[model samples]
Target: ATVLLEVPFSARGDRIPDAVAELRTREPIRKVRTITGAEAWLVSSYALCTQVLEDRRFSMKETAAAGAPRLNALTVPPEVVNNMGNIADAGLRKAVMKAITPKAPGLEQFLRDTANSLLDNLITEGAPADLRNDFADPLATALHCKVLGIPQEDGPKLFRSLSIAFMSSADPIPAAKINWDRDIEYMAGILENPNITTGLMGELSRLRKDPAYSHVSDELFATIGVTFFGAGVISTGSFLTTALISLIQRPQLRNLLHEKPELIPAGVEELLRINLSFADGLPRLATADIQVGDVLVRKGELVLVLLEGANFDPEHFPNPGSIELDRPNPTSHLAFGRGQHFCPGSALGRRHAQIGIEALLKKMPGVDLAVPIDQLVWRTRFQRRIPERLPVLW
Candidate 1:
């Protein structure tokens, strides 16, 4: 079989949903050789994807263990994977959850204030603006920084370093190493701050007081910072940009959302389901021989549970290609993976998206794309899908 060379799978994925639909229907478990020359099975059904996620037989920890299968070099260490189990533990989960739980009144006020301030700046600067650079990037960085207890002034530098480190494909390995080192140093400084409040860092400190969790050291705290930095900013930025672009493309949807603002939450879910942000499926290694749908996956073999495929599965979502703003069971979409490896920051991501979309609708009520949809440049090689630039005018 020929190795597929879809360097920007999200772009290809978005434009060829019909082709993907066909592939899912015909050969849901077919092997495809990746750009890295690794052959992996792509699972394309909703039930099978969830099955793979929930099954403990396939382990994320072991996948990163010595002699395990991997597509790229180990940018992160195995101990970090072990720490995930600790972080996911019920007590730790509850504590951290309580620390970061969204305060609806505060969040609403924060969004309103932040959006107004940003829109003021954008409008004062005049019409033609790049939403990616001016709006989405800044808004996301600020929100992430505030939530993570980092100083607002340092947000831009963190954003730049992390973006270059994680998103850029050109010399990605070296860039990531440099950024990773700097981040460790920076997070150590933050941990030393006497005034660091009741977020993840504070919770880690509290956990450390317990003899059982004395193992949670500064390095582990740094790891948590690194995870949030990469996971929070990029995903939030991508989703914010994508949601805005979707509204721009479909004016009627925007108007409906504007009129019925209460629908914002449901609208965000539908947008996540429809928008192709995550380019490829998460890679998982089968621990033992297991049947996914009709195909058998052997121990140590690699498999990809494509989110786009699963989200658009006809059996799971009828008229799957169309964006139904009020899709009854939008939560069924696997934009966030299922089971043990489900995204820990899903609530935060949802909050950011809701604030961003609602803010954009209110402030830029008359905003329209400055250029043709075809002319909008799409980001090609990043882990998350985003537009290179979103030119808009109000």
Candidate 2:
């Protein structure tokens, strides 16, 4: 059921490279196929993307239903799919909020120190360095480990599973399954500890005493914790990597912020807007026959929300292609998503990038891309579009 024009056009730089823009002129609503051959609607317009995401008729829950469309060949575990975004338990969601929110205890200071230290290491290690691995991966991994209450020793073990779990292959079924099993076992081991009585997982563990909530076994709690880790690591890591890429390409934007420190907040917001982490949109199933603009999504049909297109839609964002740091309402981007399923970790993720980039540029004032932008390697998967190596020199 692929359209003559395949979906999710990519860009060499920050923007989506105009495939969505081209599609907007062709058809407001069109059918597209996933990398592994699943069929779904590709909703490209900002109006349609907003309408579909906010409407209750569209269900993230149902996208994982038995016959729902998928973005890849991997099969999501029922436990994972059914409880996506911690939807099954309000307590679980609250626990996630507690862990990820910028207001989470000690996290702000942790981010500050972590970013500074990472920058220091980046400087000491010297240039032509891999920022994604040397800087982004370590920062996010340590943050999630601390939040999840995993002991320092087990951090490497847990991250190994995570590395495989977040691989960018469209047909990663074999390794994905193997890595997932190892991930589950390692996460389960962390939950068995009574000593983990503080961070996000600790708060999750304490919920067992509350009669107000459903029973939360160590396993489910572990699953919940792992899900948070999944959120905390790769995507956040990508943002860290992507933001640097933008600043490197636009050295004036970096210097402007370095010259006037107060503008980084809005600068970070604009970077978020320009960032394209997900290629294919997040999928939702129609709860009933629903109108997505002029196109009708049948009951149980898959509707893919083209977030990259939505963010770049000129109708909503007047100068959508250019990065305007002072753009009013910079949070308008759907990179963090929208509605109830919007990312809970958005604030923390933003905070990390905002603080980290500010500190990094401040410390290492001369960093820039080492190779030509076109020479850098990037993942072909629609999801992880960030460069594999953000090689840089001062």
Candidate 3:
């Protein structure tokens, strides 16, 4: 009479539960229940996580199949489950990729300038700042707005919608629809705005008007804008917020990177490797019977990839819990995920965190938690494991 362990064992991002390590060693591929009350195979080992992700038979798109077990209710329309695929189908993948790249002319500089500016405000405002809202979220919002070629003043309204937009639940969210429609209408307006000729939406606007892409639906154009902006903003914001906690807690490592600022990139890679931002395991629907570890995952079964399980595996990363800047396989982590749906905004996300950390270290080298780590309230039933407020001081 054993009870099945629920998915998302804990909402706290700062620490990994002991059960996660035990499961990785004892049953790398074990059955578990999701928020939707559906059974799912929770893959925890590094090798098995890699196997499941690298194999396309574990389809991300098919997770939306009616009657199939779901990791969560569809936050976007069912078709949007294959966002990158839709962009590719419309011949807009390259443009989207190019637009979001951190290497885009002036993009990195924009990040640096924005990071410095944000830090400057925080410094003037004095100590005991709410880093999550005041610093990380604002920077994420500003960067996404810049990348989307939208008015920066409009960022807060779009940012406000994400708390509802990224919910993970058993039932549908009414507010999700309300925000989605409002965002779509806003994006639709951006597409028609002649002044928008620079970022992703600008390129999408041109492509929408192209004779070759005329068959692409207006829904997709609006969806792309809404989706990219939400995904990028949420991701970079959450990652930076968690990474700050990681850095601030490790004063020795923090000081090392602060002194030799050139190591910030390497430090950022290590930070990415250990990030516990994704609140739930990455979900995939098995399209075929696949031998993963000890289990034969059959077609239509739900499989969840526990990223921290892989990232923290003792066999893969020696002293896996520590933030070692010089790790040999630094960038080989599943933080940005792997395979077909690997994050399109990976580079930009990295740059955003790297720049944010660099500016914070230079400006507030004494940064540390103002409140005890355990006192921070964690947001639950959401895509990312974020503290409701990251109170900090220097």
Candidate 4:
């Protein structure tokens, strides 16, 4: 029965299936068939999930190696598997980091303003509004547009690319490549435009001309722009959309947070821990023989780190399913991941959700699902666990 289990057990973001709990206890590192029909270790315990991520021998880039077992097909070219590494190798890490950080000037205010504005539009539109398309997605798109120094009006077009760009499929997606090339061309065009003088792309534009970074290819510059924009928008949007679902389900918790906005940050952390936004396990390839729990994973084998498994492991987190605001080890969850290859957009994503929830609770204190829980249609074969349309009302 354990070997027969297929990953992505449930696409529903609101509830973690009982199977995750059963596996965490029974077979934490058992083999399972991926959507691609490839067998890989699905590590579901906190100790082993951490071990895989913390050890450099388990490589992220190696997952793209030809003939290696795959959890899913690559949407982008294999070089993109090491996008951040490429940035670091090009010496543009400092500039890229500075631009994407939440600490960027006026970023928080922008997030707050954008969140409020989107909620206002929803308020005017009345009940049963699609929060996914109208609010959460728009806010994410706008924030990314501002971060990339692209015109906010241009966001929708770039946003369109993500559906294909981030698709998790068993076979390569043809449209993913088409959108990638078009977006790359757009990004390259932005670099030469005289008016592009702010945000991440702006900073990168200036650096491209400097002798210190003269050797950096135009492709890298454009790739950074396209990659960051798509990744940021998709992640922030999907996370906020799912987090909203979590908040709406627990009226008592929602009302408590609404009454005390100051506790929003702590609540956001707990939300991050429990958020089922990542639809699939984080994949890594073994560089050498390494013992993980009771299993000895050999070189060239694939391993998957299940985030929910780690976040919900009872031994590490007692009553792990509950969102207790006062947990002493509140920030210990690997929601943004651990060790190297951890999401660089962690601060930005945290601030994005914090301000988003804060503004949402203030705007509509009575916010709740407008339809039956089962009516919500979750997106499938996508990187993030999110609804197709999150219908809600105040």
Tell me the TM-score of each prediction against the true structure: 0.92, 0.92, 0.98, 0.98
The residue pairs in collision within model 1 are: none
RMSD of 4: 1.1
Clashes of each: 0, 0, 0, 0
Backbone clash tally for model 1?
0
Give lDDT tens digits, candidate 1, residues 2-81. 64633224463234356678778887776775545567778787877888888988777776666654544445556765
User: How would you order the candidates by lDDT, starting with the best?
Assistant: 4, 3, 2, 1
Q: What is the per-residue lDDT of model 3 for residues 1-394, given as tens digits with 9 covering 90 to 100?
A: 9879899899999998999999999999999999989999999988999998999999999998899998899978889999889889988888899998888788878888988888888889888889999999999999999999899999999999999999888899999999999999999999999999989888988999899999999999999999999999999999999999999889899999989999999999999989999999999999989899889899999999999999999899999999887788998899989988888889999899989998998888999999999999999999999999999899
Candidate RMSDs in order: 2.5, 2.4, 0.9, 1.1
Candidates 2 and 4, the one with greater lDDT: 4
Instruction: Assess each prediction's global lDDT (C-alpha) against the native.
Output: 0.74, 0.74, 0.92, 0.92
Backbone clashes, candidate 2: 0
Query: In model 1, which range of ten residues has the least summed lDDT?
Result: 5-14
Local error of candidate 2 at 192, Å? 2.0
How many Å off is the CA of 140 in candidate 1?
Answer: 1.7
Sequence-dependent TM-score of model 2: 0.92
What is the lDDT for 105 in model 1?
39
lDDT of 4 by residue, 165-184 (tens): 88889999999989999999
Clashing pairs in model 3, backbone N/Cα/C closer than 3 A: none
Residue 209 error, candidate 3, Å:
1.5
- lDDT of residue 149 for candidate 3: 88
lDDT of model 2 at position 319: 84
Candidate with better TM-score, 2 vs 4: 4
